[model samples]
Target: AFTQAPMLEQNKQLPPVDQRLPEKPLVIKPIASNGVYGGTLRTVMRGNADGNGILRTIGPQGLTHWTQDIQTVEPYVAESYTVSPDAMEYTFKLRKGMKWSDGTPFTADDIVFAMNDVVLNKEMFPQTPSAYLVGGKAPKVSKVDDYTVKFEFPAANLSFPETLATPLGQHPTLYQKKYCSQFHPAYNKNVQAEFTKANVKDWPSLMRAKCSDIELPSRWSSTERPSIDPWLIKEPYGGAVTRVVMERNPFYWQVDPTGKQLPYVDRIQYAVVSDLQAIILAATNGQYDIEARLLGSDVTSRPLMLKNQQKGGYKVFGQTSANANAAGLWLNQTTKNEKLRKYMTQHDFRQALSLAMDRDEINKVAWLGQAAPWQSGPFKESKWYNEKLATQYLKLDLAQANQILDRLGLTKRDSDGYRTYPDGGRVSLDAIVMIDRQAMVQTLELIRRQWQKAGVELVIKGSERSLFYNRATANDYDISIDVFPGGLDATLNPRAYVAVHPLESRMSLEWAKWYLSGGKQGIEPNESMKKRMALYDQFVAAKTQSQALSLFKQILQISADEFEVIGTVRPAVISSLHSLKLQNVNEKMPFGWPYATPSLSLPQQWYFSKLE
Candidate 1:
């Protein structure tokens, strides 16, 4: 059904296109019928200062490969794959003459090196990121030949394909064996000697400092990093750097239906700006060809962008967030203070807190009244979404909240009219949040006022990005606010949905740590948490989609019952701005952290119509 390219001119040293591509190469039909190559896609990034610069920086790198998708994962570097009937064994067939960015033959050995020396090795990955593990065990990876690789899981882990599609799975999982092997002590006997020569602590530490050139997607802003991404960072991001420039990868595998090598754009220039407002100004000034990474480009800023659409030479399109709750309140269930911990663990307290909030007002003020007022669950778009469950206890009923508090015997009050514990001690809760999220501060300010009216001393403390997460992981806070990014595939990366993951739900860090480390440390969670964890495990190991769906429902039901996090507003219509000259850019792109923005829209096919 699709036309194929003949052997490329530069691909003579490599195999012919027929052999270079898999039996079935990922055939990407461009959104536009006629795509002429050559142009620069200029965009702005806020660099590490905002901690989200890497997101925009990796957009081009992410487009160079293919993976399993919410839609479909047409074969790219991977020609095809086969799964065992039991779903434990997954064998991937690679393209024949596929080469790394450095022209080294890309083979199964790279996957093998990543698995054996990086992912599985305790030195490289101390904890072994949970993404690579199924049923708490890493798969037994083996290379069948130069082009075929096999992964044997402990059990029937059906979500392996989806795992490969995720952002965390995309990196490390795809690396050059020759380049990375030098950093690995297991592969290179000279690594220890080199570490000593370099005055590094060990091979792992040495690799982390020296291997930026070989890393993909994450440390991709490094110009020395040789990747097969459609574009290569010619000028890397560094101190005092205003812009990072990327040039086209000469060895790019994908091609248009008419036999043109992909990435019609010749270059991508990312200007590192001061902040979010600066990005908005740049977009208005027509400084960017594609400007969707505007951080504060929610409904609040949409009107401004829309008002200047004609002058700015850009168009704003609606985008949906994968997160059911764009922002939520996570009360620490394992607070150091006995009084707070006791109250935080109670379902009645969490429910009352959820009920006390005026979500409609929050939606109006913070999200420009664009969001849906609902408690946290899967987004309505998700098949597992239950409207009733998501809307549960999301009413602004102050009387009911007071009643529940009275029923809990916390009727005592302090001089400031704030509620006190049964011991007459003050109940001042601190909600630690990152200062980078401009919208979150406004939302928290409104929430603080609402809670103050209910006799609760809710203090919103904004901290630096790194400190916020450190405090959260340490469980040294009363409460924390964050946007929960899940619901597209509940089981695939079930972090915020269940108490099993120790990262997002700062509420149950103790429970999560216990589960993550197999009861080595941290307090064991109660029966409800245990059940949810079990459901998550079952969801991961489910043999069929139906089985996974059933388990996901159970997890959502338990999460609803527990009310571990107080969800505020469901994702509303967000805006994506792109220059009118940029063609093939989708009007509506689903938002999620798994595959990053713009990449989800298939950025490779996006070409400039008026390329000067």
Candidate 2:
């Protein structure tokens, strides 16, 4: 027998609990013992751009769900799915009696409308989102039957299901077409009436104002928009509202192992705390039921958190993100200056510089000893872990670094006692980093001092986030500094392992162009890099998980042999705050958000042992 929250049961006009749930409701096994329902999960939001925090709690789940294991994903919303042998076509079978938050039947038509009426609509999306495209064209999205839909791509797109598993992949369920289509001219004859009513320029802007769920502050601001998430917006985020409040979605599709309607809490109340300092203090004082976001990787408030845990009536849990390294220096091999590029392109030079860093000091100073001395590769915990790649140049040896530089014919000295190039010029390089990344900026300062002991002259340039990316992407900077992406779990997304994302790769934007343009433009890399790139392509095209795993292992071996990026330290431990009353939450987690931290862990099954 399925049961619901006391508040839900009080709604006399609502359908029966069985009827409100999908035919095949997702079963969430509690991390601990089964929980009693009744309480609000209080959390703080910045009332600013901490939208992902909001999204994860109320709007995390999709048709596919990220599993507890970092690599695998399982069907969550779609009852079952089948991928064609070529992996080009994916067909999803929706639960027969699934309903949106507003009690409208969710079917194949909604998926079709998502592609045809919204995603493919020229006015709404002038250029299609890159995720929706394969081989420079959008896939054919069609309704197979009332309960099924299929996506047929031109090429073998094996990662399509993984893409759908992300939080942003809720496009198919985004528009409650029955309610949202009133804004579109195709469905409604009176475009003028709708636009005039909303006070927007046209239907496209009005539709976004009314129906866009992916983009935020607009995402949580509209109470009218229907969603398939566990919670529904009651009092929206914007306007005169002091705080954001979301009530339980009566038609939520997940049930606990014991067949109780999930999201055991009755409400999610977000206190609108503007100052981050104030929010941090509040978190230490046990003001939240579950606090994940806004807790900085800097670990500044950690001491206070530990000190006050017993007094504050909360527990602290630590997590390591997929970003294995706190700061990974991407010495641009494709620097605009031919002279700087001369040294950067050399393999030994990069490795020598990596050895110069006192990674232990960096961890102590920047992260307060919360992070480990690590290289730019997978974490030791990951299955893709490679010892050489992660620890090859992690030692701080100024003498060895100096000797390597001398062998490279940089033995000449300048007036400043810095090493000179073989060209008889002082070897000075400019490294640019985004200013707001406080931890990365601090680490670079340490690097600038430590590298001097190795006779290297380095100049640090601090730029804004926008200008930093612009300069880095244009290949105008020398050594580009940023946090590593997905190094701990490279198998999940090896964008950093290969130079797929030019800006993220930072080492070689030209190589990224070469790969993206199908070798049509930009500089061609060495044979090893070319082979690694090809291996990444092969990995993405694999028909089975074992094939994907084997291909990635080869890719890791290549990465280990060739150190593409210089890593400093693993990220500082992120302390997740949980109220003592909260139950069925993990003590440790793989802190990869926009999906992993809470979504895969299943927040819906979380309940309070006591009522507030």
Candidate 3:
């Protein structure tokens, strides 16, 4: 026997199922031929509550799903979309009767509110997001009808829709206009009075306290913040609550071909853990239903995980990470130390550092010889991946490194055999790293030993994530450890392709900030960096995919020649953990930013053999 969705009882005035669904609903084939509804997924997260929220926002539990494949776009929240012949205008059709999780009608007005009131609101977002901007101008969003929305851009933007499907694109206002408008001045006429009443400093601060990004777990804490996600947070997140529990969204759209509305599971439970090892311990003991965070459980921990696989009632599936490079040396080209910056900005100096690295030894020691020893750029899987970029200067050549540094006039050494700085100061470089992950620590330590052999003294300092990020972005650190992304869908987001921003390309934080801010704040980069930025601008403005592809090659060529980020290991096989009790979960699904895992794998259709 079949049953009507639970939302029907609460909304007696709503239309019938046929009228609420799209004329042609997006169809998703079940992982298994059949799936039973009602179960809960419990997992452990290494990050704090906010970090866990980011994971959920990017994963299947999030409201929007950016399809796994870059070549093809999937219909999720929007039933269908059409781009104008000029590629400047985009029109999207929403499902007729789609309702918010709280049972309110979802329509074009909701999207319009998000575009005009939130994104276009200067007070809310100080800087306009580049994704919505065309030729330095934001797109104009218009409501065509109750169910149709149109976006007009200044120039041809072929990849605009794909960008919308990213984690950054899936902001709160995209789904919760009616709920958020209560805090906004335009919609809520008495908002200023309300702000003063609440004793908050400003609208943004008031908004932050009252509401949160719907994709974020913090928003899940507020009963006022509704989501279209399959699961809704069960209660407020903070205070004495150490764990987060989410219940299925009764008003959820889409279903298996068998007519069971997803998600088949009834609830999701997330147990917070302190660190990476804690997550590994929890996963090894079978505390999680599914966890891609297992990738951070260290490569050496793989055998231990697999050895106790049956005992823990879990399975470890290896998937090729879609990151460009898993581990790399991020040399701050714009360090505040002018003496060091002179040496770091040199191509030969950067090249010598990469050449001195014994990548094979590092990979063998850290990854048990599983990772590929390759240079930094795009992954081998990417269409834009340049073979030259992947292998250039990756070999271990202590003699060549010594020669290159010798030519740089760094032959002067102190009593410790460490090369003295050009200023005659000690040349001991601090490698500020987030050493929480065992694998990252091992990788950096291995490189430290190899660098010392080349007459470079590297003082590895283990620091927390925030400290490392703050220091790197502020251009206060000499070097840092980071990974390059954009392997699968490099074109959709070319930030990492060229040194566009500090968040992605840690090496050129100052240069990227300069380019992103239209050179109003940070210092203008030199000729080479300027050329790279200009080429990236061309890549963004290109009308056709072919033109974009050509620009991608040019950018990668420059990056390889310059040795922007010296990589240690290439795209490697990372493991994902899943409890054997769950069904309809595809083991072969790829994991990366392009393909938001669990979501791309279709978590909604996953069910349990038995419910607790």
Q: Write down the RMSD of all candidates, one decimal each.
A: 3.6, 3.8, 2.9
Displacement of residue 512 (Cα, Å) in model 3 is: 1.9
Alpha-carbon TM-score of each model against the true structure: 0.91, 0.86, 0.93
Evaluated against the true structure, the overall lDDT of model 3 is: 0.72
RMSD of 1: 3.6
Tell me the lDDT of model 2 at 232.
84
Per-model clash counts, in order, read: 0, 1, 1
Residue 490 deviation, candidate 1, in Å? 2.3
Better structure of 2 and 3 per TM-score:
3
Number of the candidate with higher TM-score, 1 or 3 = 3
Model 1: weakest 10-residue lDDT segment is 60-69
Which segments of model 3 are wrong by more than 4 Å?
A: 5-25, 49-70, 196-199, 214-217, 294-297, 610-612
Among residues 3 or more apart in sequence or in different chains, the pairs in candidate 3 whose N, CA or C atoms overlap within 3 Å are 60-599
Assess candidate 3 and give its TM-score to the true structure: 0.93
Off by over 4 Å in 1: 1-26, 49-69, 196-199, 212-218
lDDT of 3 by residue, 420-474 (tens): 7766865666788887767778898898899899888788888877787777767
lDDT of 2: 0.79
471 Cα displacement, candidate 2 (Å): 6.0
Q: In model 3, state the lDDT of residue 420.
A: 77
Superposed Cα deviation of residue 572, candidate 3 (Å): 2.8
